[PDB]
Symmetry: D2
Subunit: 117 residues, 4 copies
Amino acid sequence: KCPLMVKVLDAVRGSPAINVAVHVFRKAADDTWEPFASGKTSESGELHGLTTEEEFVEGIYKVEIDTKSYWKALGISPFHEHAEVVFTANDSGPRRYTIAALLSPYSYSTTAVVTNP
Amino acid sequence: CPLMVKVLDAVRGSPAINVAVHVFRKAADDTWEPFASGKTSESGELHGLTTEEEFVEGIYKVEIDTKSYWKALGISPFHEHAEVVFTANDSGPRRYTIAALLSPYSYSTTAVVTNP
Amino acid sequence: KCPLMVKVLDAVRGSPAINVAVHVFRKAADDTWEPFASGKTSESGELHGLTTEEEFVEGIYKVEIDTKSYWKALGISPFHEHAEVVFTANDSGPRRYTIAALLSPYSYSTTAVVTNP
Amino acid sequence: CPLMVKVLDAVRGSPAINVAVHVFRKAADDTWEPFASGKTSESGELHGLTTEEEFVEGIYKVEIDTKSYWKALGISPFHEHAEVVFTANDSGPRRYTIAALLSPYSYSTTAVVTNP
Ligand SMILES: Nc1nc(-c2cccc3cccnc23)c2cn[nH]c2n1
Ligand SMILES: Nc1nc(-c2cccc3cccnc23)c2cn[nH]c2n1
Ligand SMILES: [Ca+2]
Ligand SMILES: [Ca+2]
Ligand SMILES: [Ca+2]
Ligand SMILES: [Ca+2]
């Protein structure tokens, strides 16, 4: 899957970032964050299967990538608690979203690739 | 001078001017308490957010309102904002600069932590 | 293919960067750049098939991504002439290299993912 | 002040200090003629590369010796260097800053072009 994919790379080692926890939240009508989906990156640094076309409705989503546990498992003390990405999804109908992240101990960058299925 | 934010625009090749920035500190109940805020200057910098006495160790979030910035320029943005969350640890003397580089569908952020 | 792949994304549109020309050079024994391989990114922003295991020997390689023609075709006046990446390849035996690039009109970033086949 | 380079280190969270920077201009035969060079300061900045009279329109390459920088820190690097190639165009008054953010297997660069 499918409509929402996350890909994570490590800029120190030149590798996929493997076994990174990713948590997705959706803003509820009362303005709180409701848990939506979560998972871990594979050996290729990718996380497929978060959601389905049925479940992934319009809304404001937050994707939190647990960069802190990643670095700590490699024995490194990182700066950021996580890398987040917050965006409005599916406003003009369903789209496929890939959230890509590139990690360093004191920096991260993220991009979105949005395609019309 | 303990906390400074600096923002650049990767589309126009310029400082990101008049961008709203809010800083929050994580409270004991895990909620975010507003801590400081301002708007970037003509140089894309925001100085004077806090003081040495106020800025204690803890977990902080710097939220940069990128969506309003892109909309004021007529450019279509992806993200609601950019949120930068980090732990401040006392080691010896430190100044923190949070630097960010903005594009419509991407952003990057780095921390520059120096000893005055 | 295979040992050398290039992937290009557009940070303005949130899309793959399609039909981007990529030229690869290898440093010759006289210290000049010898043409090595070239191609164009596909609809997915990827360029496979540049080289083969046989041809891709040790050496210092330059990958030049024609970012200027990309932007000009979209009607935009960009800053950089190209995005390059220069690196020593295969020094401790064959590796697979992915050179990924993220483009904006006044900025680019690049990362390398190196895996042991 | 027409050309400045500023370099940051994404691993250590610091300015990239004592990094060698060479600038070349593209010659009529398509070769690169050395034009200016220096080493970044304690702030990671390199000022005084050129003068307004010298810096004419044309195609320039800023080569940042990232490999020597990482090796002096004991960190294993991927790239030989970082080469940043751009066209300078006269529009009205302009100052150029080439900013770069370094990691061992990645770098990014942006241009900040302002009107003094
Ligand atoms: N945020 C971010 N993600 C990427 C990036 C991450 C994962 C897969 C990709 C595939 C192609 C191009 N990019 C990536 C890259 C690469 N250079 N800079 C970047 N910045
Ligand atoms: N290429 C590049 N340069 C920067 C960057 C480098 C040097 C000084 C700056 C001052 C303000 C904002 N940015 C910078 C930053 C920061 N986050 N991501 C980046 N990417
Ligand atoms: Ca709608
Ligand atoms: Ca402390
Ligand atoms: Ca060898
Ligand atoms: Ca001109």
